[PDB]
Design an enzyme around this catalytic site. Sequence first.
Site, PDB file in Angstrom:
ATOM      1  N   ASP A  52      18.743  22.577  12.905  1.00  0.00           N
ATOM      2  CA  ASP A  52      19.655  22.921  13.997  1.00  0.00           C
ATOM      3  C   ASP A  52      18.920  22.856  15.333  1.00  0.00           C
ATOM      4  O   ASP A  52      17.766  23.328  15.428  1.00  0.00           O
ATOM      5  CB  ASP A  52      20.156  24.346  13.853  1.00  0.00           C
ATOM      6  CG  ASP A  52      21.224  24.515  12.813  1.00  0.00           C
ATOM      7  OD1 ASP A  52      21.749  23.539  12.243  1.00  0.00           O
ATOM      8  OD2 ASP A  52      21.600  25.688  12.636  1.00  0.00           O
ATOM      9  N   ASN A  59      23.689  20.842  14.129  1.00  0.00           N
ATOM     10  CA  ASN A  59      23.033  20.519  12.864  1.00  0.00           C
ATOM     11  C   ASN A  59      22.869  18.994  12.681  1.00  0.00           C
ATOM     12  O   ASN A  59      23.889  18.303  12.687  1.00  0.00           O
ATOM     13  CB  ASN A  59      23.924  21.130  11.746  1.00  0.00           C
ATOM     14  CG  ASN A  59      23.276  21.104  10.374  1.00  0.00           C
ATOM     15  OD1 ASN A  59      22.279  20.442  10.180  1.00  0.00           O
ATOM     16  ND2 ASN A  59      23.896  21.782   9.399  1.00  0.00           N
TER      17      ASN A  59
HETATM   18 NI    NI Z   1      23.095  26.620  11.759  1.00  0.00          NI
END
Ligand code: NI
EC number: 3.2.1.17
Length: 129
Positions: A52, A59
Amino acid sequence: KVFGRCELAAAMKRHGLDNYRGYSLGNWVCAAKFESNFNTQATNRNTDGSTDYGILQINSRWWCNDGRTPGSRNLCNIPCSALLSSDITASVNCAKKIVSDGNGMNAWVAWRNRCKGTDVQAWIRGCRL
Ligand code: NI
Ligand SMILES: [Cl-]
Ligand SMILES: [Cl-]
Ligand SMILES: [Cl-]
Ligand SMILES: [Cl-]
Ligand code: NI
């Protein structure tokens, strides 16, 4: 960059997040607080091997390219490093796609677990917006 609370609220508002997909500004500030602590440089490895990135912990499995997430997409058409910039434009543009994908802000698990249903207006208290 580590944004201040009102500083981030103002930037998100300028970039059209207030009420985007029906989500008030405080929802977005709350999400960013618990995703990144308002730090644009935040990165965190996920258990599935994706990572992330940035203010909203976007992501690499679906949204950006980091070159090390197999079988993953890049639906925002952006290198993940572009989500770490002081200027939040790319993160915001990408977040708009994420929140439009069907499940709203539930795409951010921390939003669902820590923001959803709470007094999110508190996150913009005192801000001159
Ligand atoms: Ni996350
Ligand atoms: Cl804060
Ligand atoms: Cl709000
Ligand atoms: Cl990859
Ligand atoms: Cl910015
Ligand atoms: Ni990817």
